[PDB]
Write a protein that binds this ligand. Structure first.
Ligand SMILES: O=P(O)(O)OCCNS(=O)(=O)c1ccc(OC(F)(F)F)cc1
Ligand SMILES: O=P(O)(O)OCCNS(=O)(=O)c1ccc(OC(F)(F)F)cc1
Ligand SMILES: *Cc1c(COP(=O)(O)O)cnc(C)c1O
Ligand SMILES: *Cc1c(COP(=O)(O)O)cnc(C)c1O
Ligand SMILES: [Cl-]
Ligand SMILES: [Cl-]
Ligand SMILES: [Cs+]
Ligand SMILES: [Cs+]
Ligand SMILES: [Cs+]
Ligand SMILES: [Cs+]
Lengths: 268, 389, 389, 268
């Protein structure tokens, strides 16, 4: 499929940026997570980034660490995540779905088999957080064999060689990191380095989504203005889950309000 | 692109977030430069001699082997400043940190020995040290925590995940991901992403180099085998390195068997785990069926790696080194035996290596064999553990 | 009649019951013979090198003395096997016991370090060791008691008198009075009846001999002063001995001042006691007005002699050595300072010597002085004492 | 004075041995100790050996260790001991009184001063337990200047040189040790080595008293038969004190019975 390509073409036609929430699958349980995801979509999410709970999420700060822990407390496994993903796709045929993976979960049952399962359930992209471009060959090859976009990361400090590799090897979107460090709303990054955004376009990279520390509408607007195709927000969304664990209905209302506001900021 | 090979056969690599690659490349560059720099080498040698107390003795056991054809020597890393071999490589890494112009050190620790080693090196060499330690480890390692604090290190409990060593490893990397411009991550074993397995081996290889010179002096020949315990792999690779090209010398690594391999309560991933990718490397590890990382169990907290250094996995794969396991009970018996027959109190970690040597001797008492056990540390820390049993 | 002079000026002698005189004469004879025997010397040197880890390092402090004209080195007896200098002389006395054909060892201990040293030497060398320890000391030194037991020694609590070190000294002598035909009394310091002050000095003198060679190598000249703590006097006389004839080298012994000399709660008999006769010798001691023997108080249990070796009293009397005191609080500050600025955890005993060197530097920071402190032991044992404060 | 010489002459006239109990002064208190001592004398003690409580009695086994401790519990000091000694002598003008001392108590206030005090209260001998003949010069000189007999010890193993020194330097009596070790009734020694007893006589030593482990009449008789002038018993006497602490009247009755039996054994 070509779900990101179709999305970005549609958004470009409307001079609009993408807003892309992240949540952990199965946080705080399978049924509530499915409701959360439906709420994100109804509230205007253009695409999703979905984490499979992992024991050792070493690119994540405390907010998302705690989401992984809640999912484990609910007994969530990768197999259950795939069941969730198949159902999400059955409900929502066009929204791009990206996974946030750690390498061991991809390598565990065999790399090729993992990407084959992604294709079967209708995932569009996979970002393996602890595989740098230097180690990426078997992952990107398997992704492409199964019509999955492999997502690569452009750090703010990226040199020309790295920009060329990310441009060549990635598909779907290019992840533009706002800053060093780990995920977290408590730590705001920079405006998309215009120089990086322009070099990526020069090298015909997949459209850029800025992520890390994106918690406010004003940051979404600024990302798009700087030339990114959109913005990803994780911790800010997950914080709403955490705050409202005891109040599942209020949780969905607050998620809807927040996502609506973030998506509004992406519009021309 | 790297200067050195990041792999040992299929094992090893640099499985870190993209943001950390410049830090690993910088470290590799600084290490390659340092290894060719006679001034760096002289400074390292000076600290090892005059501060740490190298060379360490090579002690012939005679009482333990009486009535057999085994001759057993112990390489006395228990006599190094700090009481374990860890001191060697922390001094080298502290000097690398300074070479790169870094003023801060991050370290992980489980049992606390690496934390103490890191704090002592940082105190000596004017570095600001922060140490991550799983909250469960903090609770059970009060002595080591107090030592770290006395030496001016910040000890930061880690409550995420299982609140043990792997969680502290993660936290150290999360910190470094944001702080690498000013801080060096002083990794505590011959594992993690390249270049750490290589650096740690090179900064521990004096163990084997000295052993070779000492055994040649005393016996006029090389050992039939050298035997070392394997947590993450540093003391073992430090003993093995200078013998790898001496094809006649057996290399035997001893993983903790815990309550017994069959119980699943062990720390023997090399022989009884499954290859995975975690903590920056492709290596055998303790993992669930689905690929979640698990803990290693041993009576010895210091053998509490849930994986193993990639060079050990490689040496095993090609048959150059053999790996075995020793249970809690076997280690305890070796501890008691060394205390009573040689007047040396060994670390429970090291007791695993000694236990396997004792088995080699006892199983085949008329086999002529010259063995060296790496006595990686002293066992003062373990007397209450052993007492309670 | 004796072969060697039992006195140092008026101090020393052989104040034992008549029944023990043959044992002391036999010991003296065996010692004089051993000192001329190249085989005995070679065996002792071999144990010191290959078992105990001599020579010990001489470490230059630079961080501690920054901004002053003091240069400070530490003689690292903390790195000897066992963690204190006591190991040197127990190995020598164990070899004497064997030379005399004895198979059993009696020892006294207070803090437990001498007991552990005696037990380790006895385990190595095939001797049956029994250790007397005041019941109050047994209660408060569980770690050391367990170490002694692990090494196969019998630990015998002494409930008589004050149930502390002097009482254990008495009990050891009472046992020897009946058992001297088969047992050697392994006295733990440079005190007691002749020939012990002499033997212990000679079996500790490698401390000063090495220090001299090391300082000449590093500085091209002798120290301005060497500084050592004084419990019974062994580590201090071992450091001092080879410098006694180097008239330019100051010899400074540091007694424990406890809560302060003025409080009476101290262990400083050389400077603040009164000459008496006890434990086989004429020497300054802690005694009541009527002549009953008293205890020494110090935060450091190892400085818990209620007297001092006669050679120290003599060197003081002729002005060849100067003796000073350091309080609990001064020792604690030195402990903390060394941990934080040099990454070395010193014994609280040794911390008294370091504290006095720190005072020498701080009081007169523009005085050019090259100082050596004997770091008699490591302070792992003391972390909980220091913690609780 | 010449109290030992007079005693031994009187005993020789009757072909009789001496029986000499030891007790610790002030055990279990001053008043009871004075009563104990009067009882010993009335029951037939020929001489006394009296210990001054010392902190570190390193020639004594547990029985006498515990006597020293009881005296300290009663606050007994050397000055109080001297007061006791003056009164004992005022009551009993001819009985030889020997002290069992440790060196520090003699050296404490000055050696000469100690022996001067002994002369003033009427003590006859002093045995300093931890001063061997080799260290004895200032002690024996001060003793003789103050008409006090210095007592020396002949171990069972004594060589000829030692026998000659003990014979020359001692006065009053020669102490013949029954065995190595420390005081105690639980450990019986040998018969007086006839060879030692005869050599001492050859060298004109002061008459021999055998001590250590002497607890029974049969041992007293045997000592005298072997050629000793008598026998000393300490622990056996002190054990009666210890056993009867709660019963002071019974204590005196048992002491009387025991001493009477021991003295009877010395008679021809
Ligand atoms: O809004 P924040 O700060 O929580 O950021 C949310 C990011 N979620 S994600 O899945 O895009 C994401 C993307 C990349 C990550 O690590 C890597 F860069 F190393 F690959 C981790 C998470
Ligand atoms: O009957 P026992 O076994 O208790 O012996 C009692 C002895 N009491 S004593 O005062 O004669 C006495 C005599 C000598 C002593 O020691 C010495 F030999 F070293 F000098 C100790 C006590
Ligand atoms: C830490 C430690 C070990 C295990 O670590 P390695 O990296 O495998 O050497 C072994 N022995 C001692 C004494 C230790 O402190
Ligand atoms: C026992 C001890 C001392 C004191 O004894 P000395 O005989 O005076 O040396 C000093 N330092 C340490 C570390 C000790 O263990
Ligand atoms: Cl592309
Ligand atoms: Cl005479
Ligand atoms: Cs052998
Ligand atoms: Cs392991
Ligand atoms: Cs200086
Ligand atoms: Cs002292």
């Amino acid at each position: 499929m070509e779900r990101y390509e179709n999305l970005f073409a549609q958004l470009n036609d409307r001079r609009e940026g993408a807003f892309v929430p992240f949540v952990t699958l199965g946080d705080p349980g399978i049924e509530q997570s499915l409701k959360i995801i439906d709420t994100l979509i109804d509230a205007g999410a253009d695409a999703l980034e979905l984490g499979v709970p992992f024991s050792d999420p070493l690119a994540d700060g405390p907010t998302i660490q705690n989401a992984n822990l809640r999912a484990f407390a609910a007994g969530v496994t990768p197999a259950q995540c795939f069941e969730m993903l198949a159902l999400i796709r059955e409900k929502h045929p066009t929204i791009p779905i990206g996974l946030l993976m750690y390498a061991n979960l991809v390598f565990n049952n065999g790399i090729d088999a993992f990407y084959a399962r992604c294709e079967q359930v209708g995932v569009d992209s996979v970002l393996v957080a602890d595989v740098p471009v230097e180690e990426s060959a078997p992952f990107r090859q398997a992704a492409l064999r199964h019509n999955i976009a492999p997502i690569f990361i452009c750090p703010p400090n990226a040199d020309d060689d790295l920009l060329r590799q990310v441009a060549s090897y990635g598909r779907g979107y290019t992840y533009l990191l706002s800053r060093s460090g780990v995920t977290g709303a408590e730590n705001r990054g920079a405006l998309p380095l215009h120089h990086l955004i322009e070099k990526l376009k020069e090298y015909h990279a997949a459209p850029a989504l800025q992520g890390f520390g994106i918690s406010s509408p004003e940051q979404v607007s600024a990302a798009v203005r700087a030339g990114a195709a959109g913005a990803i927000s994780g911790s800010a969304i997950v914080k709403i889950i955490e705050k409202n664990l005891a109040s599942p209905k209020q949780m969905l209302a607050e998620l809807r309000s927040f996502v609506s506001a973030m998506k509004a900021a992406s519009r021309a | 692109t790297t200067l050195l090979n990041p792999y040992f056969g299929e094992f090893g690599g640099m499985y870190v977030p993209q943001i950390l690659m410049p830090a690993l490349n910088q470290l590799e560059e600084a290490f390659v430069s340092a290894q060719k720099d006679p001034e760096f080498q002289a400074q390292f040698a000076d600290l090892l001699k005059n501060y740490a107390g190298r060379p360490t003795a090579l002690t012939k056991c005679q009482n333990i082997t009486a009535g057999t054809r085994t001759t057993l020597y112990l390489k006395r890393e228990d006599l190094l400043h700090g009481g374990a071999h860890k001191t060697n490589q922390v001094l080298g890494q502290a000097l690398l940190a300074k070479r790169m112009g870094k003023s801060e050190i991050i370290a992980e620790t489980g049992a606390g020995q690496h934390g103490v080693a890191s704090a002592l090196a940082s105190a000596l060499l004017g570095l600001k040290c922060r140490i991550y330690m799983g909250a469960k480890d903090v609770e059970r390692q009060s002595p080591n925590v107090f030592r770290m604090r006395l030496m001016g290190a910040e000890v930061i409990p880690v409550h995420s995940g299982s609140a043990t060593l792997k969680d502290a490893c993660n936290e150290a990397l999360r910190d470094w991901s944001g702080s690498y411009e000013t801080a060096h991550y002083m990794l505590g074993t011959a594992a993690g992403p390249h270049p750490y397995p290589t650096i740690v081996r090179e900064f521990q290889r004096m163990i084997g180099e000295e052993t070779k010179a000492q055994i040649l002096d005393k016996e006029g020949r090389l050992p039939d085998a050298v035997i070392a315990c394997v947590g993450g792999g540093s003391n073992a690779i430090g003993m093995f390195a200078d013998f790898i090209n001496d094809t006649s010398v057996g290399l035997i690594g001893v993983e903790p068997g815990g309550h017994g391999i069959e119980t699943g309560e062990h720390g023997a991933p090399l022989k009884h785990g499954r290859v995975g990718i975690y903590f920056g490397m492709k290596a055998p590890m303790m993992q669930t069926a689905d690929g979640q990382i698990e803990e290693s169990y041993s009576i010895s907290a210091g053998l509490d790696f849930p994986s193993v250094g990639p060079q050990h996995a490689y040496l095993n794969s090609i048959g150059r080194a053999d790996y075995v396991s020793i249970t809690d009970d076997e280690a305890l018996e070796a501890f008691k035996t060394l205390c009573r027959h040689e007047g040396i109190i060994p670390a429970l970690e090291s007791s695993h290596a000694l236990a396997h040597a004792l088995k080699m001797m006892r199983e085949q008492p008329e086999k002529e064999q010259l063995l060296v056990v790496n006595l990686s540390g002293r066992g003062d820390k373990d007397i209450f553990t052993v007492h309670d049993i």
